[PDB]
Amino acid sequence: PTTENLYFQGSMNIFEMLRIDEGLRLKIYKDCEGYYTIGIGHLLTKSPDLNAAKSELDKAIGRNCNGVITKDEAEKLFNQDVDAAVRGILRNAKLKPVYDSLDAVRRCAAINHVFQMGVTGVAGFTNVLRMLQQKRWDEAAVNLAKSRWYNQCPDRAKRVITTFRTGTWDAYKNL
Numbered sequence: 001p002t003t004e005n006l007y008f009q010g011s012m013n014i015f016e017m018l019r020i021d022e023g024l025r026l027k028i029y030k031d032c033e034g035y036y037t038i039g040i041g042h043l044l045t046k047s048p049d050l051n052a053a054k055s056e057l058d059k060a061i062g063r064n065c066n067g068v069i070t071k072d073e074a075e076k077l078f079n080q081d082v083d084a085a086v087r088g089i090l091r092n093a094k095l096k097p098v099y100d101s102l103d104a105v106r107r108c109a110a111i112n113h114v115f116q117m118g119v120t121g122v123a124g125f126t127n128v129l130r131m132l133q134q135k136r137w138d139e140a141a142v143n144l145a146k147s148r149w150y151n152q153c154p155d156r157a158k159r160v161i162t163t164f165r166t167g168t169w170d171a172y173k174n175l
């Protein structure tokens with residue numbers, strides 16, 4: 001590692017991580033499963049009706065957006081969604097002990113997973129939870145690679161799986 005490469009971990013954090021996996025879009029779009037999304041991975045609704053999505057949008061931003069937001073508004077919604085995922089882990093009796101056992105980088109991958117799937121989705125991975133607590137990283141990653149979450153949209157999930165395997169930021173290098 002060069003002096004610069006050793007600096008790369010101090011530049012990575014949950015916000016930079018999710019920003020890479022989710023992208024940044026200032027107009028309403030459909031994500032890889034066809035669900036209306038905006039900003040940095042903010043799922044607006046699962047309904048096929050673009051009208052619900054715009055209404056959810058104006059609600060979340062608090063103005064008449066007509067489907068378009070600013071970078072600063074994107075950042076704000078994103079920070080709220082990150083806070084919600086972390087809070088969702090910490091209050092949950094099953095996820096909190098596993099999260100507490102993890103190192104800082106794998107904790108970021110855990111918050112990313114919850115941001116993407118939701119609390120009950122993640123807490124259903126009974127086996128992967130036990131694997132992670134037992135530091136069985138290879139097995140946890142192979143089992144996450146069996147999931148619909150990863151297989152229906154691999155490019156959004158692949159870096160998170162690699163990060164559970166390694167506990168480093170290497171999958172976020174060299175975009």
Ligand SMILES: C=CCc1ccccc1O
Pocket residue numbers: 089095096098099109110111113114122123125128129132
């Ligand atoms: C079970 C998969 C990973 C994971 C671990 C701990 C907390 C949340 C989370 O998504």
